[PDB]
Amino acid sequence: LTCPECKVYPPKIVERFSEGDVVCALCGLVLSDKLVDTRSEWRTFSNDDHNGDDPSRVGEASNPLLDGNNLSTRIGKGETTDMRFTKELNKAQGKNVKDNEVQAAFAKITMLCDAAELPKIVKDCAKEAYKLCHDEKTLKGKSMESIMAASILIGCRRAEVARTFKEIQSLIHVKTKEFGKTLNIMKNIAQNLTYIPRFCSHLGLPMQVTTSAEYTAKKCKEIKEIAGKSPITIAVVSIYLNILLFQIPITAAKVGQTLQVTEGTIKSGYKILYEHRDKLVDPQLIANGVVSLDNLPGV
Amino acid sequence: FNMKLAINAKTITSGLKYALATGNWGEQKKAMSSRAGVSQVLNRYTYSS
Amino acid sequence: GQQYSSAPLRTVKEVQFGLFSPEEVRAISVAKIRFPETMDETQTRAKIGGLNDPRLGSIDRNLKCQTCQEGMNECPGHFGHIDLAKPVFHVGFIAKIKKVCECVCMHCGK
Amino acid sequence: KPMVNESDGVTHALYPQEARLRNLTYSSGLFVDVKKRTYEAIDEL
Amino acid sequence: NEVFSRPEWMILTCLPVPPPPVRPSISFNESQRGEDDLTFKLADILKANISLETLEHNGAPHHAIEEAESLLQFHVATYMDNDIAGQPQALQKSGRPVKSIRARLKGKEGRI
Amino acid sequence: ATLKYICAECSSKLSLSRTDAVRCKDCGHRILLKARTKRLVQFEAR
Amino acid sequence: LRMKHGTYDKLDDDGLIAPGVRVSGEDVIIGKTTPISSKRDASTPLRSTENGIVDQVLVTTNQDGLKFVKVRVRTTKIPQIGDKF
Amino acid sequence: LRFGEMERDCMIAHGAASFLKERLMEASDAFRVHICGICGLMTVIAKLN
Amino acid sequence: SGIVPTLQNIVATVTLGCRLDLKTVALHARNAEYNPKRFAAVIMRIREPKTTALIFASGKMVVTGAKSEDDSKLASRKYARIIQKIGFAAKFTDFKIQNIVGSCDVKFPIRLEGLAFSHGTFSSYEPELFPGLIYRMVKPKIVLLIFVSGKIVLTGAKQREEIYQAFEAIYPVLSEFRKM
RNA sequence: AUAUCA
Ligand SMILES: [Mg+2]
Ligand SMILES: [Zn+2]
Ligand SMILES: [Zn+2]
Ligand SMILES: [Zn+2]
Ligand SMILES: [Zn+2]
Numbered sequence A: 001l002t003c004p005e006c007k008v009y010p011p012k013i014v015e016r017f018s019e020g021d022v023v024c025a026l027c028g029l030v031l032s033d034k035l036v037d038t039r040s041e042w043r044t045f046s047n048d049d050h051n052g053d054d055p056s057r058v059g060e061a062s063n064p065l066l067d068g069n070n071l072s073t074r075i076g077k078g079e080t081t082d083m084r085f086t087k088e089l090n091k092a093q094g095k096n097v098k099d100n101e102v103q104a105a106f107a108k109i110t111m112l113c114d115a116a117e118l119p120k121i122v123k124d125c126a127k128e129a130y131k132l133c134h135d136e137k138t139l140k141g142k143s144m145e146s147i148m149a150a151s152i153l154i155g156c157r158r159a160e161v162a163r164t165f166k167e168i169q170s171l172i173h174v175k176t177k178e179f180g181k182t183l184n185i186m187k188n189i190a191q192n193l194t195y196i197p198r199f200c201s202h203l204g205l206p207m208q209v210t211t212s213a214e215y216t217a218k219k220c221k222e223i224k225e226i227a228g229k230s231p232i233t234i235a236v237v238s239i240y241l242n243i244l245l246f247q248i249p250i251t252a253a254k255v256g257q258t259l260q261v262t263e264g265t266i267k268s269g270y271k272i273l274y275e276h277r278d279k280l281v282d283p284q285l286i287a288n289g290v291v292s293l294d295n296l297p298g299v
Numbered sequence B: 001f002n003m004k005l006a007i008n009a010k011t012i013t014s015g016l017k018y019a020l021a022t023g024n025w026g027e028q029k030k031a032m033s034s035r036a037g038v039s040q041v042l043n044r045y046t047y048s049s
Numbered sequence C: 001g002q003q004y005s006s007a008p009l010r011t012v013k014e015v016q017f018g019l020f021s022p023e024e025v026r027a028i029s030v031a032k033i034r035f036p037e038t039m040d041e042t043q044t045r046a047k048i049g050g051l052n053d054p055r056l057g058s059i060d061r062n063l064k065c066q067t068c069q070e071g072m073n074e075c076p077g078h079f080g081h082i083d084l085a086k087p088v089f090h091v092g093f094i095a096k097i098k099k100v101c102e103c104v105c106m107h108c109g110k
Numbered sequence D: 001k002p003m004v005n006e007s008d009g010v011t012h013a014l015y016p017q018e019a020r021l022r023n024l025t026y027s028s029g030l031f032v033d034v035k036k037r038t039y040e041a042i043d044e045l
Numbered sequence E: 001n002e003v004f005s006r007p008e009w010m011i012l013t014c015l016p017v018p019p020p021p022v023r024p025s026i027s028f029n030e031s032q033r034g035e036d037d038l039t040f041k042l043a044d045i046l047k048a049n050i051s052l053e054t055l056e057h058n059g060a061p062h063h064a065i066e067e068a069e070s071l072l073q074f075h076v077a078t079y080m081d082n083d084i085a086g087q088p089q090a091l092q093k094s095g096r097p098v099k100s101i102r103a104r105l106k107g108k109e110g111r112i
Numbered sequence F: 001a002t003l004k005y006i007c008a009e010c011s012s013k014l015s016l017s018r019t020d021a022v023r024c025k026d027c028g029h030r031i032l033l034k035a036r037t038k039r040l041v042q043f044e045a046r
Numbered sequence G: 001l002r003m004k005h006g007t008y009d010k011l012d013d014d015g016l017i018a019p020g021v022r023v024s025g026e027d028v029i030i031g032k033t034t035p036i037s038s039k040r041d042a043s044t045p046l047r048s049t050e051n052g053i054v055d056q057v058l059v060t061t062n063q064d065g066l067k068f069v070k071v072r073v074r075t076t077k078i079p080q081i082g083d084k085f
Numbered sequence H: 001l002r003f004g005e006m007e008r009d010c011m012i013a014h015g016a017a018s019f020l021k022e023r024l025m026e027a028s029d030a031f032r033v034h035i036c037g038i039c040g041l042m043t044v045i046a047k048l049n
Numbered sequence I: 001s002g003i004v005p006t007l008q009n010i011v012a013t014v015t016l017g018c019r020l021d022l023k024t025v026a027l028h029a030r031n032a033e034y035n036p037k038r039f040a041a042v043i044m045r046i047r048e049p050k051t052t053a054l055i056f057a058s059g060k061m062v063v064t065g066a067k068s069e070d071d072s073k074l075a076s077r078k079y080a081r082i083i084q085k086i087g088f089a090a091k092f093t094d095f096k097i098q099n100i101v102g103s104c105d106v107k108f109p110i111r112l113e114g115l116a117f118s119h120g121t122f123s124s125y126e127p128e129l130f131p132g133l134i135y136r137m138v139k140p141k142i143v144l145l146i147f148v149s150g151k152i153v154l155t156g157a158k159q160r161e162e163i164y165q166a167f168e169a170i171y172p173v174l175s176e177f178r179k180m
Numbered sequence J: 001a002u003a004u005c006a
């Protein structure tokens, strides 16, 4: 819209919703009189009416981004209904029904996220990653239970939900090298800090320990003390340093068990970091019990 | 027979959350006849209320 | 407002109820309606020559209403047709149809 | 006792006030002992 | 009446399709879009139609056709009236029954 | 000077910006408040 | 697009009014946009029939971590004519 | 507000023919169509311009 | 600079032109392995140049392990002579180098994450999966494995110049992302 | 849909 009388390039116009008019703010000419409430109009599509009494409720919302435009009701039981005609009209929908059934692979993603404790924004990215790569010739014939296992880490890597590839190896399934190549052909079409909360919780450490481990691990990387060790190992090692520094300790066996790393490996990172333990700790860390920097195992 | 794949937690979790929230005491987002108003928001106008 | 039309302004004096002859339904229609797709020319932002405005009514603060133009606050919206594969009963008559069969010969139509 | 599973994995206790403010649910975990036995016979025991 | 209402005109052969004003759509935010229950019910009629047309054209299996016809019969019928005695209601995903045309005119709060 | 947000329980000031992490420094609790405007408000004493 | 005729000046650059500012009808408490393409206005204005001073404003994330903000507005209602007792 | 059925009745009782027409038209709903003289339908493609 | 990549492995193919009886080949060769159940080829070896050959029934042969193009052709002719000596009507034809691998050391540590962010469309870096950055060069079409240590691997070349070309092209980039 | 208002 632009005022026919004035015409200034930045067309300064207001929507006086309350009087249901669209006005030109300069000359005051009314540019439109019919004006509709979009909130209440949207209430007619997505309501709270599941019973069926609302006369205002007359439509339904859909998702054109995920399921395209497939409008379709379902034959079901009503108040006055014979259980015979429901069966026939449903047995008649069976002859009219392959790819309109591969949408049940969304039910595979939804049941995987809920088994992996994943948010509602991750499922919808995993379902959009799967819809745009399951019929690709670039994926061709990859393990069909390992291409949807790869599109879940694609949806997590945008929704900022920290999930290692070994965390999705535990869910399903994953063949490592098989869902690692598939996680790249689709990509063409974590850190220390990520694990620390969970590992610490299982460890049963206090916030103080978590924060310091978190600070050490970052510094370890910043310092580049651990050249190429896996972040999981770095984190487990840092957790070892901080915890040992505090009162409630945790052993390598226990840390490794939670981090799902091996003591030997944690040892490997730990000793690399130990030399710069001083630099690593948070500045206002309070070593307690009897574990000061000098005394830390050093192992 | 992977356990995590077998038991769907969301079944009972969101199944109760639905009832308590909306108030249609039944399963689930496909409710009728279900009895609406079983669960409702607590009046906090006055203490007696 | 709502713009001027040279057409004579008159009042409705009689209302003549009736049923739609399929010939007429076809004759009024301004679009064929071939596809169960709303709009989305496959992931797009325009109506599909198939369901709502295949040639039909206009919405979305945009004139395009088949020559008619005008747009929303003038266009009444014009009908499309759908050609059914086999005859079906109009639910409302189903009984008047039944009664008519009950009155006439199911072979000669007398 | 009532708990909450935050976005960053960590689970911790949850008091009624935090529930009302962060619009959470004041719920606790349900855990059940499960056992999976296996049996076999040839062509009653 | 020979002019305005011949009995041959009671059985539906062609279906007048109402324009958007009668069944408004709303385009929210590119991943949210709302269509009217009629637009849903129509799409089912169409889908059921396109199906039965292909069946007759192809090798007509008699009993697999009349099976698809009485599906079409249902969708067309349930679109004008969803509150039919004896028949199952057409439902819309959320469990709520489709607002048929009859039902928009009917009650107090109806169009009348 | 300047306290962008305050803590709900421990009442320690926070002063954080966009994408800094919605949590308090020492205590966990993601609650956090807003702290009054420096644009002093005047009221009629009636 | 489609901005509210109300005023947006009381918003700090985080899109919120700081607590203590006095508000009034049609004024914008919470500034929001729903980018789609540049972007439409999805802001929250104070009810047009009311007014008062902002009491408290809190910023949080929820069960899945969606940033969401609650704004409290305080008024003092002094017995008027049609007031029931 | 709703000038409902019972209000229509009072106006009909008063004999306020033009006051009623106004409430129902000018004060609400009122619209203009072009109809055909042969088949009294809203079919007319009014390219009024 | 001053660094020039060292060739580490050359893979070549040769058509012998006649069908072979693998049990016979394996039996008569001085340094052969043959287990039909594991792989369908005789794995034959010679001491000079030190190489390994995969010999098929079709008469096709793959020769690998050489450090120079000269050594590759030399060892290939030698394998062909062995087949002849065993009695088949083999011919040394279609010698073609299919892959050349090279490596070097730039002598400084590299910031792989920075490089991956900067050269995102050519890079692939998942340190938990594999510690090196996989860089897919357009011209020449060579794949480089880049490590934090500064050690570099170049592969996918059909000609030696491509190995040399790619390194020359990558060096400025490695310098831009150094640690000390 | 609940609660409520005369
Ligand atoms: Mg009274
Ligand atoms: Zn103007
Ligand atoms: Zn028109
Ligand atoms: Zn007869
Ligand atoms: Zn605090």
Ligand SMILES: [Zn+2]
Binding pocket: H036, H037, H038, H039, H040, H041, H043
């Ligand atoms: Zn006409």
